[PDB]
């Protein structure tokens with residue numbers, strides 16, 4: 063799947079970064095503590111560890127399960 067524009071409306075299930083890393087679940091503060099949660103982004107579709115763009119980034123992204131890599135853009139292409 064691909065995203066349109068900045069991907070703020072992307073609701074797919076892709077969960078892999080541009081370096082092949084697995085996205086961290088949005089509801090998790092582990093390994094990375096953060097504030098991109100449904101509490102603060104109720105319209106963001108912050109579901110499981112799905113690639114999302116809740117904060118008007120240029121493209122969908124996620125926190126990563128690698129403790130040494132906080133966040134990355136997802137390996138999704140623009141439509």
Ligand SMILES: O=C(O)c1ccc2c(c1)CCNC2
Pocket residue numbers: 096117119123132133
């Ligand atoms: O972890 C953070 O403080 C943080 C800050 C800014 C941005 C992200 C994460 C994700 C991408 N959008 C900008």
Ligand SMILES: [Cl-]
Pocket residue numbers: 064065066067069070071072073
């Ligand atoms: Cl989209």
Ligand SMILES: [Cl-]
Pocket residue numbers: 117
């Ligand atoms: Cl920001």
